[PDB]
Amino acid sequence: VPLDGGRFATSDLNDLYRRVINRNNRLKRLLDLAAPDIIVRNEKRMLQEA
Amino acid sequence: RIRIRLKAFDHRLIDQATAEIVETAKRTGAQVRGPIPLPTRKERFTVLISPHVNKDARDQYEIRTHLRLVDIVEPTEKTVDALMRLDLAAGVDVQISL
Amino acid sequence: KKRWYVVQAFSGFEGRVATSLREHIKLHNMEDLFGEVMVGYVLVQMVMNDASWHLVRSVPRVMGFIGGTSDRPAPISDKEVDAIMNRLQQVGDKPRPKTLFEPGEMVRVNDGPFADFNGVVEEVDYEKSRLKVSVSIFGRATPVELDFSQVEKA
Amino acid sequence: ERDGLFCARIFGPVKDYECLCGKYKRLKHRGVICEKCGVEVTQTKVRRER
DNA sequence: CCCTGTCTGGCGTCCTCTCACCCCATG
DNA sequence: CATGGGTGCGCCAGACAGGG
């Protein structure tokens, strides 16, 4: 829901879900053209922490 | 930018229907070339009417199909859906080539 | 012999990290210890001394290397590096569905206002890179031209 | 968004019984998934359970 | 293995009434 | 325009080492 002004005051769970989906899309891209082990280990580790 | 070529048998219908096909476009796209008529294809079938002899009594028939063009100017997504999806008048062919 | 290593930067300031890295090299004049810098990850041709490691981590807006450990960080275990390099060049000049939309072949639209609709390609134009397919709008297949990537082969 | 954190087809229509924009603005065909943008056709609290 | 020290977690009163302020930043 | 990353609390208690 927005506030008086109009800027949407967004919840915290939308930040959490949007982070997990951004990282998951990056990791899938790192499965198609993909990239070396160290890269996908950091990518999966950032998804795990997300 | 997008040729709008539409065909129908009735002239009072195809020319009525071209008034709203630009009224659904100039409301949003606000630029159309103009209603272009096209020379009509008159197909004739003159054939016998008796079930036997007297091959001198024939009845001339003719089916007139007309063609109109408006050739809309602006390819903005709003105008695209307002014509592509919004096709009206059943019994009137309309075919588009972008 | 200089082997490759992976550097993590603040994602978005990557060109500025690359420029500051070249400038720190030409400041602390370990010119014989750095080969190139390739562009959120920055590739560095390098050797491993602890002095050069402190140099790269003292470059601003750099988090650290990415490897097995932080004592002796890890060079390059290429697994999909070649694929990514080839994909970049291929994308530069290459089509998605390669206009395999022949006449009478059904296709799928996922772009423009015709998104989420199927149809058939009555005519194809490999030279103009355009497929002539009509999409049943209100039942009326609205013959429209879509690119190979704009539509998918059905 | 078409298919984002806050989708139409995956969850439901924001407005009650309204599909999306130009489709179903009365009470006759509750359910037809319009072609303009994939969307369910239900009430306003249907997204809270989905 | 049997006791001893450390290391992290889990927790701490209820209703109300105003106020002020909610992501830069930028090629 | 849109995305991308301090240093003043105190007790209980059980799990994890650490001797013992």
UniProtKB/Swiss-Prot annotation, chain A:
PTM summary? Acetylated on several lysine residues in the presence of glucose.
Which parts of the chain span the membrane according to its record? none
> What is the name of the gene encoding this protein?
rpoC
Parent sequence residues shown: 253 to 302 of 1407
Applied uses, from the record: Co-administration of salinamide and rifampicin or salinamide and myxopyronin suppresses the emergence of resistance to both antibiotics.
Share what the entry says about its subunit structure, partners included: The RNAP catalytic core consists of 2 alpha, 1 beta, 1 beta' and 1 omega subunit. When a sigma factor is associated with the core the holoenzyme is formed, which can initiate transcription. The rRNA transcription and antitermination complex (rrnTAC) consists of RNAP, NusA, NusB, NusE (rpsJ), NusG, SubB, ribosomal protein S4, DNA and precursor rRNA; S4 is more flexible than other subunits.
Q: What name is this protein filed under?
A: DNA-directed RNA polymerase subunit beta'
Domain of life, source organism: Bacteria
Q: Which cysteines are joined by disulfide bonds?
A: none
**Function field:** DNA-dependent RNA polymerase (RNAP) catalyzes the transcription of DNA into RNA using the four ribonucleoside triphosphates as substrates.
Q: What is the lineage of its organism?
A: Bacteria, Pseudomonadati, Pseudomonadota, Gammaproteobacteria, Enterobacterales
Which family is annotated?
Belongs to the RNA polymerase beta' chain family.
UniProtKB/Swiss-Prot annotation, chain B:
Q: Give yes or no: UniProt keyword Transcription.
A: yes
Known partners and oligomeric status: Part of the 30S ribosomal subunit. Can also form a heterodimer with the transcription antitermination protein NusB. Binding of S10 to NusB is mutually exclusive with its incorporation into the ribosome. The rRNA transcription and antitermination complex (rrnTAC) consists of RNAP, NusA, NusB, NusE (this protein), NusG, SubB, ribosomal protein S4, DNA and precursor rRNA; S4 is more flexible than other subunits.
Q: So which domain of life are we looking at? A: Bacteria
Looking at the UniProt record for this protein, which Gene Ontology cellular component terms does it annotate, in alphabetical order?
cytoplasm; cytosol; cytosolic small ribosomal subunit; small ribosomal subunit; transcription elongation factor complex
The entry lists its GO molecular-function terms as:
structural constituent of ribosome; transcription antitermination factor activity, RNA binding; tRNA binding
Provide this UniProt record's keywords sorted from A to Z. Ribonucleoprotein, Ribosomal protein, Ribosome biogenesis, RNA-binding, Transcription, Transcription antitermination, Transcription regulation
Please name the gene that encodes this protein: rpsJ
**InterPro entries membership:** Ribosomal_uS10 (IPR001848), Ribosomal_uS10_CS (IPR018268), Ribosomal_uS10_dom (IPR027486), Ribosomal_uS10_dom_sf (IPR036838)
Gene3D superfamilies under this entry?
Ribosomal protein S10 domain
Q: What is this protein called?
A: Small ribosomal subunit protein uS10
- What is one Gene Ontology biological process annotated in the Swiss-Prot or TrEMBL record? transcription antitermination
Cross-referenced SUPFAM superfamilies = Ribosomal protein S10
Recorded hits in SMART domains, A to Z, give: Ribosomal_S10 (SM01403)
Curated annotation (Swiss-Prot), chain C:
Say if the entry is tagged with keyword Protein biosynthesis: no
Domain spans labelled KOW: 103-134
Query: An example of a Gene Ontology BP annotation on this entry?
Result: ribosome biogenesis
Q: Which keywords does UniProt give here?
A: Ribosome biogenesis, Transcription, Transcription antitermination, Transcription regulation, Transcription termination
Among Gene3D superfamilies, the record links this protein to: 2.30.30.30, NusG, N-terminal domain
**Any one annotated GO CC term:** cytosol
The task this protein performs is described as: Part of the processive rRNA transcription and antitermination complex (rrnTAC). The complex forms an RNA-chaperone ring around the RNA exit tunnel of RNA polymerase (RNAP). It supports rapid transcription and antitermination of rRNA operons, cotranscriptional rRNA folding, and annealing of distal rRNA regions to allow correct ribosome biogenesis. Participates in transcription elongation, termination and antitermination. In the absence of Rho, increases the rate of transcription elongation by the RNAP, probably by partially suppressing pausing.
> By its UniProt entry, which PANTHER family does this protein fall under?
RHO-INTERACTING TRANSCRIPTION TERMINATION FACTOR NUSG, TRANSCRIPTION TERMINATION_ANTITERMINATION PROTEIN NUSG
Assembly and oligomerization: Monomer. Interacts with the transcription termination factor Rho and with RNAP. One NusG monomer forms a stable complex with a Rho hexamer. Binds directly, but weakly, to the core enzyme of RNAP. Also interacts with RpsJ (NusE). The rRNA transcription and antitermination complex (rrnTAC) consists of RNAP, NusA, NusB, NusE (rpsJ), NusG, SubB, ribosomal protein S4, DNA and precursor rRNA; S4 is more flexible than other subunits.
Domain notes per entry: The N-terminal domain interacts with RNAP and the C-terminal domain binds either to Rho or to RpsJ (NusE). These domains are separated by a flexible linker.
**Record-stated family:** Belongs to the NusG family.
| Entry protein name | Transcription termination/antitermination protein NusG
Q: Which organism is it from?
A: Escherichia coli (strain K12)
